[PDB]
């Protein structure tokens, strides 16, 4: 990895564009104000600091490689070789940057400063926004963690209403997204962001990322169970679906097992194969190791409701203390097709209307959880708010006439708790007046060193729901 080749091309040319006599560029990240996504989980900067920004990130070889690439890419010599060589020679290739950030896992309303970046050497005024591109990719773990948390709020509301408690909430949304994301690196980052809120994942890449960059007291941060796929059912031949089911449940008789049941006819599988032919292998199972029937096609809500109606007629259903129907404890359902925050809401509301407890179900989400998200969802943005030119600080901002939502903050910023316990971003260096308590931004990176780190356990505690609290 070469940090000189890890920026948007145009940023190579910006050192020639800033006002002459500029010694400081100070920039900030927010999820701009515009499911409403009123608050965001701050997560993932520590990964970026450690993997890409810390230590000796400039060498003679990286400077020459960048110079050679940019000569061809621009068909001109515009690269700031002198400025990068300055960092190599003066700081042994360590970036003269200070980053201050809200603690990871903090849940912050939209339109607040989450982190700030500034150069610590006047010669490196251009470096603050060089690293915008790398740092703005924090949008992704923020957005995954935030959208996963918003789904946890929906599950918590319906579980509480239909059962009176939150037991097993942290296992109710399982990551099925490894195949559906755009890269191996995205898989690890996204899976780790989902694990801020939940414990169930098949995206194995998330485990190694958490171990390397964050750390847990427990051996692993996420868990799974044996489960079939269409290949392990259909390989038996269509006439032998029952033989596949029997073999699989028997192989994993003492742990929970998920069995995809829609290869040919989900309704037949539930009513006749599970319901009658193999019923003796289901009713013998323990509470700790239930059979989890997995539909994977059709309208998500209609299919869940029809599967529950079938199973409720073939198995001994109880009524819990809230008046909701509960399958026996050896039998559960997972809906792992077509699940995103919108369809999750539709399914749990549909179940509540048909008097089915959310205790009966869990959800698998792949593309909806890890891929169907953009930087525009929370309006994640990085902008310069302060410069020093000719030794004088000036408050800098954009305010496009056709879009007031794109207006940016002015001056030096700080994040504070309000008297009512909410959050406020003070602009124009007004934090210096000390009318609002301590600034919540902490130095996390300075002059090539990570200065403050968070464990994954601390991040999970910070990101808890109020209902859990």
Ligand X SMILES: NC(=O)c1cccnc1
* Residue 252 near residue 226 (C-beta atoms within 8 A): yes
Long-range interactions of 282-289: CB distance < 8 A, separation 24+ = 282/249, 282/315, 282/330, 282/331, 283/315, 283/328, 283/330, 284/330, 285/253, 285/330, 285/331, 286/254, 286/330, 287/329, 287/330, 288/255, 288/256, 289/252, 289/253, 289/254, 289/255, 289/256, 289/257, 289/330
Cβ proximity to Na ion, 91 vs 223, nearer residue: 91
Q: Which stretch binds ligand TIE (CB under 6 A): 130-138, 284-292, 305-313, 348-356?
A: 284-292
Cβ proximity to Cl ion, 84 vs 324, nearer residue: 84
* Residue 94 near residue 4 (C-beta atoms within 8 A): no
Q: Which stretch binds its own copies (CB under 8 A): 105-113, 128-136, 326-334, 429-437?
A: 128-136
Q: How far is CA 294 from CA 258, 269, 310, in A?
A: 6, 11, 14
Among 74, 171, 236, 267, binds ligand TIE (CB under 6 A): 171
Among 96, 188, 190, 336, binds ligand X (CB under 6 A): 336
Give residue for tokens 């006002």: 19
DSSP H or E run through 23: strand 22-31
As a dihedral over the C-alpha atoms of residue 6, residue 9, residue 11, residue 16, rounded to 10 degrees, the angle is: 130
Q: According to the annotation, is 375 in a ligand binding site?
A: yes
Cβ proximity to ligand TIE, 8 vs 89, nearer residue: 8
Task: Quote the least distance from Cβ 363 to ligand X, whole Å.
Answer: 11
Long-range interactions of 226-231: CB distance < 8 A, separation 24+ = 226/251, 226/252, 226/255, 226/256, 226/257, 226/258, 227/202, 227/257, 227/258, 227/259, 227/260, 227/292, 227/294, 228/257, 228/258, 228/259, 228/260, 228/294, 229/260, 230/260, 230/263, 230/296
The interface with its own copies within residues 283-312 (CB under 8 A) comprises 296-299, 303
DSSP 240: G
Task: Quote the least distance from Cβ 331 to ligand TIE, whole Å.
Answer: 9
CA 400 and chain centroid, separation: 30
Under the binding rule (CB under 8 A), the answer on residue 436 touching its own copies is no
Binding mask 377-396 for its own copies (x = CB under 8 A): -----xxx--x-x----x-x
Q: According to the annotation, is 336 in a ligand binding site?
A: yes
Take residue 138 and report the two structure tokens written for it: 């924090």
Among 13, 22, 50, 59, binds Cl ion (CB under 5 A): 59
Binding site partner of 59, from ligand X, Na ion, its own copies, none, Cβ cut-off 5-8 A by kind? Na ion
Could you give the strand order of the β-sheet that contains 361-365, starting from the edge strand earlier in sequence?
A: 173-175, 361-365, 331-335, 291-294, 257-260
Task: Label each residue of 399-436 as H, E or C.
Answer: CCCCCHHHCCCCCCCEEEECCCCCEEEECCCHHHHCCC
Under the binding rule (CB under 8 A), the answer on residue 208 touching its own copies is yes
| Measured distance between the N- and C-terminal CA atoms of the chain, rounded to whole angstroms | 42
Binding mask 75-94 for its own copies (x = CB under 8 A): xx-x----------------
Cβ proximity to ligand TIE, 225 vs 450, nearer residue: 225
Binding mask 345-384 for ligand TIE (x = CB under 6 A): ----------------xx----------------------
The interface with its own copies within residues 238-277 (CB under 8 A) comprises 238, 240, 243-244, 247-248, 251-252, 255, 258, 262-268
The interface with ligand TIE within residues 201-240 (CB under 6 A) comprises 225
Under the binding rule (CB under 6 A), the answer on residue 376 touching ligand X is no
The interface with Na ion within residues 251-280 (CB under 5 A) comprises none
Q: According to the annotation, is 296 in a ligand binding site?
A: yes
* Residue 29 near residue 114 (C-beta atoms within 8 A): yes
Among 221, 256, 295, 448, binds ligand TIE (CB under 6 A): 256
Task: Quote the least distance from Cβ 207 to Cl ion, whole Å.
Answer: 20
Task: Quote the least distance from Cβ 186 to its own copies, whole Å.
Answer: 4
In this structure, the number of other CB atoms found within 10 A of the CB of residue 371 comes to 16
The interface with Cl ion within residues 229-248 (CB under 5 A) comprises 229
Q: According to the annotation, is 202 in a ligand binding site?
A: yes
DSSP H or E run through 227: none
Positive or negative: CA dihedral 269, 272, 278, 281: positive
Under the binding rule (CB under 8 A), the answer on residue 25 touching its own copies is yes
The interface with ligand X within residues 242-281 (CB under 6 A) comprises 258
Binding site partner of 8, from Cl ion, ligand X, Na ion, none, Cβ cut-off 5-8 A by kind? ligand X
Give residue for tokens 């490196």: 124
Task: Quote the least distance from Cβ 58 to Cl ion, whole Å.
Answer: 7
Annotated binding site for diphosphate: 179, 230, 294
Annotated binding site: 179, 202, 230, 294-296, 336-337, 367, 375
List interacting residues with ligand TIE (CB under 6 A).
168, 171-172, 174, 200, 225, 256, 258, 288, 290, 292, 332, 334, 361-362
């Amino acid at each position: 990895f070469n940090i000189l080749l890890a920026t948007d091309s145009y940023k190579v040319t910006h050192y020639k564009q800033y006002p002459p006599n500029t010694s400081k560029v100070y920039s900030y990240f927010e999820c701009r104000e515009k499911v409403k996504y009123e608050e965001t989980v701050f997560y993932g900067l520590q990964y970026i600091l450690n993997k890409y920004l810390k230590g000796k990130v400039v060498t003679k070889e990286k400077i020459q490689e960048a110079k050679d690439v940019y000569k061809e890419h621009f068909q001109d010599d515009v690269f700031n070789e002198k400025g990068w060589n300055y960092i190599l020679e003066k700081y042994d290739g360590h970036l003269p940057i200070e980053i201050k950030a809200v603690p990871e896992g903090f849940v912050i309303p939209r339109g607040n400063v989450l982190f700030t970046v500034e150069n610590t050497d006047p010669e490196c005024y251009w470096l603050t926004n060089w690293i915008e591109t790398i740092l703005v990719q924090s949008w992704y773990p923020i957005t995954v963690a935030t959208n996963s948390r918003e789904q946890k709020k929906i599950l918590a509301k319906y579980l509480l209403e239909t059962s009176g408690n939150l037991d097993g909430l942290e296992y109710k949304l399982h990551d099925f997204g490894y195949r559906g994301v755009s890269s191996q690196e995205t898989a690890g980052i996204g899976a780790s962001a989902h694990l801020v809120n939940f414990k169930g994942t098949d995206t194995v890449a998330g485990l190694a990322l958490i171990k390397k960059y964050y750390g847990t007291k427990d051996p692993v941060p996420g868990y799974s169970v044996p489960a079939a796929e269409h290949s392990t059912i259909t390989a038996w031949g269509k006439d032998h679906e029952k033989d596949a089911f029997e073999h699989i449940v028997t192989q994993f008789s003492s742990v929970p097992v998920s069995v995809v049941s829609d290869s040919y006819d989900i309704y037949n599988a539930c009513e006749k194969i599970w319901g009658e032919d193999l019923r003796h292998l289901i009713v013998s199972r323990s509470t700790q190791a239930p059979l989890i029937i997995r539909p994977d096609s059709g309208n998500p809500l209609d299919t869940v409701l029809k599967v529950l109606e079938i199973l409720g007629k073939k198995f001994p259903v109880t009524e819990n203390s809230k008046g909701y129907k509960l399958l026996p404890p050896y039998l559960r359902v997972i809906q792992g097709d077509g699940v995103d925050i919108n369809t999750l809401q539709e399914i749990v509301e549909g179940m509540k209307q048909k008097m089915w407890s959310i205790e009966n179900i869990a959800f698998g989400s792949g593309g909806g959880l890890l891929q169907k998200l953009t930087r525009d969802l929370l309006n994640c943005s990085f902008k310069c708010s302060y410069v020093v030119t000719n030794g004088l600080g000036i408050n800098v901002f954009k305010d496009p006439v056709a879009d007031p939502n794109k207006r940016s903050k002015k001056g030096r910023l700080s994040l504070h708790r309000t008297p009512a316990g909410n959050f406020v971003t003070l602009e124009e260096g007004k934090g210096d007046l000390e009318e609002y308590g301590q600034d919540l931004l902490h130095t996390v990176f300075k002059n090539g060193k990570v200065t403050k780190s968070y464990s994954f356990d601390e991040i999970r505690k910070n990101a808890q729901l109020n209902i859990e609290l």
